Amino acid sequence: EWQENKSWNAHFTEHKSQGVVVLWNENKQQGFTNNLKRANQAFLPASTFKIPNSLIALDLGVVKDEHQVFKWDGQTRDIATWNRDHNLITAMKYSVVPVYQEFARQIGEARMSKMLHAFDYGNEDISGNVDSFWLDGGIRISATEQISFLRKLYHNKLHVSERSQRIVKQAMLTEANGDYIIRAKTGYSTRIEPKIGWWVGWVELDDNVWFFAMNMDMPTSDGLGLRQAITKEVLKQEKIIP
Amino acid sequence: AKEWQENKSWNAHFTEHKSQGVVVLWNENKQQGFTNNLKRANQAFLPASTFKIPNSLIALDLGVVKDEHQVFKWDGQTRDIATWNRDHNLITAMKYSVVPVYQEFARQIGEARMSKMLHAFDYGNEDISGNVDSFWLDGGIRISATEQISFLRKLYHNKLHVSERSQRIVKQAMLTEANGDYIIRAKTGYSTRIEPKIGWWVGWVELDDNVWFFAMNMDMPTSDGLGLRQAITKEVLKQEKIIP
Numbered sequence: 038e039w040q041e042n043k044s045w046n047a048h049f050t051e052h053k054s055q056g057v058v059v060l061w062n063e064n065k066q067q068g069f070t071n072n073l074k075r076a077n078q079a080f081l082p083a084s085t086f087k088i089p090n091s092l093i094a095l096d097l098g099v100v101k102d103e104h105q106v107f108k109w110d111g112q113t114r115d116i117a118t119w120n121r122d123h124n125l126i127t128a129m130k131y132s133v134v135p136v137y138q139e140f141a142r143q144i145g146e147a148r149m150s151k152m153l154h155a156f157d158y159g160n161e162d163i164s165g166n167v168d169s170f171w172l173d174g175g176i177r178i179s180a181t182e183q184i185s186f187l188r189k190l191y192h193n194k195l196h197v198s199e200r201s202q203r204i205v206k207q208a209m210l211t212e213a214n215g216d217y218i219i220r221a222k223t224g225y226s227t228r229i230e231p232k233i234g235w236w237v238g239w240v241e242l243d244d245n246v247w248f249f250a251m252n253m254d255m256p257t258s259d260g261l262g263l264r265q266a267i268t269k270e271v272l273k274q275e276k277i278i279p
Numbered sequence: 280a281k282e283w284q285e286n287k288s289w290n291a292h293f294t295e296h297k298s299q300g301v302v303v304l305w306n307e308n309k310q311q312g313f314t315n316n317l318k319r320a321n322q323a324f325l326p327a328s329t330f331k332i333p334n335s336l337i338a339l340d341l342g343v344v345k346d347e348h349q350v351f352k353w354d355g356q357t358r359d360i361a362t363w364n365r366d367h368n369l370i371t372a373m374k375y376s377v378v379p380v381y382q383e384f385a386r387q388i389g390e391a392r393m394s395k396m397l398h399a400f401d402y403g404n405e406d407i408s409g410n411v412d413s414f415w416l417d418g419g420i421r422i423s424a425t426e427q428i429s430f431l432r433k434l435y436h437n438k439l440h441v442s443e444r445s446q447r448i449v450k451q452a453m454l455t456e457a458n459g460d461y462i463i464r465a466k467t468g469y470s471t472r473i474e475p476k477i478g479w480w481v482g483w484v485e486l487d488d489n490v491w492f493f494a495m496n497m498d499m500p501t502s503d504g505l506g507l508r509q510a511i512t513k514e515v516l517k518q519e520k521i522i523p
């Protein structure tokens with residue numbers, strides 16, 4: 038089931054922040070969180086939507102593989118790393134929104150909506166623009182719903198090819214050492230209140246997998262490093278990582 | 280194929296450790312190879328635990344291993360490497376270089392299929408004489424550092440004569456290091472059954488814009504030098520400004 042561990046609230050209070058961390062122990066089929074209410078509060082997915090968007094693009098062939106080059110559309114944008122050609126690995130790594138907006142236009146409203154329903158992804162509502170509904174549209178997902186979706190991706194149980202799922206999990210790679218592997222996606226939702234930061238993903242250990250999903254209030258960008266810092270504080274306190 | 284370039288300054292990283300060996304690098308974008316010692320780059324040695332890469336591929340392609348989560352039970356024999364004395368899947372069997380698990384793979388693959396597959400791969404000298412479950416440790420198979428590069432390049436591009444899926448799974452199992460600067464997929468080795476005892480590190484470094492393949496081996500008279508397999512490779516990578 039689900040266990041509230043309110044002592045984790047200290048890690049947010051430490052950094053004068055408010056948010057939720059949700060953890061799922063796959064071996065034990067048990068979840069933990071500092072706040073059940075906020076763990077089930079649905080927010081815009083923002084850049085964490087790159088995970089389902091990648092899967093759908095790959096399954097439909099919009100993206101042939103992780104080497105396909107997606108040319109810069111020639112608009113100079115604020116984040117310099119966006120103003121260059123990308124493939125799926127680097128578009129994930131640098132969270133290149135324009136590449137993913139083009140995927141969404143090519144997928145189209147009908148197929149996007151059908152696939153999100155097949156994924157059971159959040160509230161499955163794509164109202165808004167086809168190329169920005171995960172930024173300022175009707176889609177909403179909670180931290181606990183992020184976990185449920187990621188669990189299916191980990192086990193290749195989403196209704197897309199196994200190959201699509203393997204490629205997206207490769208593209209999610211964030212950190213690997215001799216103690217753990219993290220596959221994850223950050224997000225920062227700014228277009229609609231409340232502005233929040235996301236980090237969702239999982240930690241692979243030798244003999245278990247810990248899924249995680251956190252979001253936190255993010256009134257300015259100065260706090261963005263707290264997404265990973267606070268999550269790792271919780272993982273460390275729980276002896277999940279050294 | 281462009282002629283290989285010999286960077287003798289890399290020998291300083293061997294001599295500063297009183298060591299002898301070869302590092303081979305391949306810049307994929309430029310299709311250009313570099314080494315400190317062209318002769319040794321082309322000298323063939325037992326692959327030892329680096330054979331886990333083709334062994335994994337063949338076992339997956341033939342269904343000996345269903346996927347990277349299938350559990351191979353400990354046979355209960357206590358061996359000297361403690362991490363071997365437990366159940367394993369493909370990921371942890373690669374990470375801890377669990378020989379007994381891979382010996383069972385090879386026996387199940389069998390002599391005929393393993394010979395066919397290694398010829399299809401053009402793996403080293405494609406000679407599997409000896410015991411079916413130890414020929415890469417004390418039998419007839421030999422591979423050079425440049426031959427490791429050639430094989431690894433095919434794996435990177437999913438060009439080996441096995442399923443794309445088997446190649447993707449093995450590249451996942453080869454994951455060693457990843458940070459915001461680079462990804463390393465690689466396999467270490469330490470050949471101890473027949474002289475010369477040598478250490479191996481073969482794999483590649485994934486950058487944003489390029490891939491650098493590498494294969495190194497070096498004389499290993501004692502286990503005290505084992506850390507130089509990674510350390511010498513990384514300081515060559517750093518010298519060439521490939522990694523920070």
Ligand SMILES: *C(=O)[C@H]([C@@H](C)O)[C@@]1(C)CC(S[C@@H]2CN[C@H](C(=O)N(C)C)C2)=C(C(=O)O)N1
Pocket residue numbers: 082083084085116131132133134172223224225226258261
């Ligand atoms: C995704 O959630 C968000 C899109 C919708 O704008 C995105 C791409 C913004 C960045 S935050 C901003 C861009 N680069 C810097 C950064 O990411 N960091 C970590 C300092 C600042 C993110 C994000 O998740 O951080 N995603």
Ligand SMILES: *C(=O)[C@H]([C@@H](C)O)[C@@]1(C)CC(S[C@@H]2CN[C@H](C(=O)N(C)C)C2)=C(C(=O)O)N1
Pocket residue numbers: 326327328329360374375376377378416466467468469470471505
């Ligand atoms: C493979 O090359 C070798 C087999 C044939 O014995 C093996 C398993 C020995 C080890 S070195 C030694 C045992 N484990 C420690 C280690 O250095 N690593 C990194 C696993 C010390 C290796 C090896 O991969 O280094 N392979």
Ligand SMILES: [Ca+2]
Pocket residue numbers: 154157158161
């Ligand atoms: Ca549903």
Ligand SMILES: [Ca+2]
Pocket residue numbers: 191347
């Ligand atoms: Ca898997």
Ligand SMILES: [Ca+2]
Pocket residue numbers: 292295296510511514
């Ligand atoms: Ca040195």
Ligand SMILES: [Cl-]
Pocket residue numbers: 083084085086087133134137
């Ligand atoms: Cl996005």
Ligand SMILES: [Cl-]
Pocket residue numbers: 189194
């Ligand atoms: Cl399920």
Ligand SMILES: [Cl-]
Pocket residue numbers: 327328329330331377378381
């Ligand atoms: Cl082995």
Ligand SMILES: [Cl-]
Pocket residue numbers: 206207210450451454
């Ligand atoms: Cl990976």
